[PDB]
């Protein structure tokens, strides 16, 4: 789970 | 109404824009005007109020170049965060596959960052620290390699970009076009992204025609600026790798390391 994906998966 | 929606998403998502910046740069920041940073003394004076002084995990007694590095990269981390939220508001972006969203942001964010950075730059220096500091161009050049080589190409780009006299309604569309670029390495749904690109580019083209009727060749000028930015980022990334490899005290934020990795 990359950090950019974390930003994109935000609510 | 695509042009208005993108302009609205830009104003909503970015803490800094050209209207807010020119207010501060013109000397109208009444409460909390910017600290002018023009030598080592005024850097330390500014840091006294603008940076928190931790007890052990601190940047206090790191080298000046490294303290500026940390301030600059933390601003970039927040701009990346804002750019991600901005992209999500671009119609069609959220329906892309997740890996394509990553790729577009991976290659786009720094072209957008240096485009938008022009808004806080003039010939003498640039705003930093959320509009609360102004660090002179000469002072940055006076630092030691390789840190003195980072900002000068960005000032050069910004002088010619600011000469086009775009406003925030223009820039918002320009950044959307940077992000929705069908040319990025490793993209999957190329055809659909090229059509998103075409749609945004079309709205940009129409917008420049309405907003800048005095310069009927403004659009190809801006196409050239997108190519200038991609080259500006590839050269910047090489400087970043030098610093990541040879500068022990310049610890790169993991989000930026992920963006630069394999770019
Ligand atoms: C506006 C800006 C962006 C970046 C960026 O890539 O996010 C950056 C970096 C990377 C190495 C993190 N370094 N610097 C920078 C460091 C010291 C000095 Cl004196 C001037 C500029 C930077 N500035």
Residue numbers in the entry:
A (entry chain B): 141 to 151
B (entry chain A): 205 to 467
Task: Please give the exact wording used by the authors of the publication that reports this structure.
Peroxisome proliferator-activated receptors (PPARs) are ligand-dependent transcriptional factors that belong to the NR1C class of the nuclear receptor superfamily. The LBD of PPAR comprises a three-layered α-helical sandwich fold, which is composed of twelve α helices and a three-stranded antiparallel β sheet, with a Y-shaped ligand binding pocket (LBP). Binding of a PPAR agonist to the LBP induces a conformational change in helix 12 (H12, also known as AF-2 helix) and organizes the AF-2 surface, which is composed of helices 3, 4, 5, and 12 to accommodate a transcriptional coactivator, such as peroxisome proliferator-activated receptor gamma coactivator 1 alpha (PGC1α). Among the three known subtypes (α, β/δ, and γ), PPARα (NR1C1) was the first identified and is mainly expressed in the liver, as well as in the heart, muscle, and kidney, where fatty acid β-oxidation is promoted.
To gain insight into the binding mode of 1H-pyrazolo-[3,4-b]pyridine derivatives, we determined the cocrystal structures of PPARα-LBD in complex with compounds A and B at 1.95 and 1.98 Å resolutions, respectively, in the presence of PGC1α-derived peptide. The structures showed a typical nuclear receptor fold where H12 of LBD has an active conformation suitable for interacting with the agonist and forming a binding surface for the PGC1α peptide. Residues 200–204 of PPARα-LBD/PGC1α-peptide/A complex and 200–204, 234, 235, and 257–263 of PPARα-LBD/PGC1α-peptide/B complex could not be modeled because of the lack of electron densities. Clear electron densities in the ligand omit maps revealed that both compounds, A and B, occupied same site in the LBD with the same orientation. One of the two oxygen atoms of the carboxylic group of the compounds forms a bifurcated hydrogen bond with the Oγ atom of Ser280 (H11) and Oη atom of Tyr314 (H5). The other oxygen atom makes a bifurcated hydrogen bond with the Nε atom of His440 (H11) and Oη atom of Tyr464 (H12). Among them, the interaction with Tyr464 on H12 appears to be important for stabilizing the conformation of H12 in the active form, where the carboxylic group of Glu462 of H12 forms hydrogen bonds to Oγ of Ser142, and backbone amide moieties of Leu143 and Leu144 in the PGC1α-peptide. On the pyrazole ring of the compounds, branched aliphatic substituents formed contacts with the loop region connecting H11 and H12, where a small hydrophobic cavity is formed by Phe273 (H3), Leu443, Val444, Ile447 (H11), and Leu456 (H11-H12 loop). The other substituent on the pyrazole ring, a p-halophenyl (p-chlorophenyl for A and p-fluorophenyl for B) group, was accommodated in a narrow flat cavity surrounded by the side chains of Ile272 (H3), Leu347 (H6), Phe351 (H7), and Ile354 (H7). Notably, two side-chain methyl groups, γ2 of Ile272 and δ1 of Ile354, sandwich the halophenyl ring, suggesting that CH-π interactions stabilize the binding and contribute to the high affinity of our compounds for PPARα-LBD.
